[PDB]
Amino acid sequence: MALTLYQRDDCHLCDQAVEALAQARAGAFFSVFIDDDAALESAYGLRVPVLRDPMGRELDWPFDAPRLRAWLDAAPHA
Numbered sequence: 001m002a003l004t005l006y007q008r009d010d011c012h013l014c015d016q017a018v019e020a021l022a023q024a025r026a027g028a029f030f031s032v033f034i035d036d037d038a039a040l041e042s043a044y045g046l047r048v049p050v051l052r053d054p055m056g057r058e059l060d061w062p063f064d065a066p067r068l069r070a071w072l073d074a075a076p077h078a
Contacts, residue, residue: 002078003029004052006044013061017049023065026072 007014034040051059055075
């Protein structure tokens, strides 16, 4: 319903992502594990740390706090 930050086994790459999120003060969201759906793995795989919105957009893995927020503001929240 809200945001969607795909993650995979081990915490590190996605860890930094969550950091930017928290920093950006995104808020609450839903986590999805790609470690189970090859479809998602093939779709993302390396781009596991992909930020998706309910509007129908995504954000690059590599981002910042103000860059992630500014991207968030681009869309509504709930």
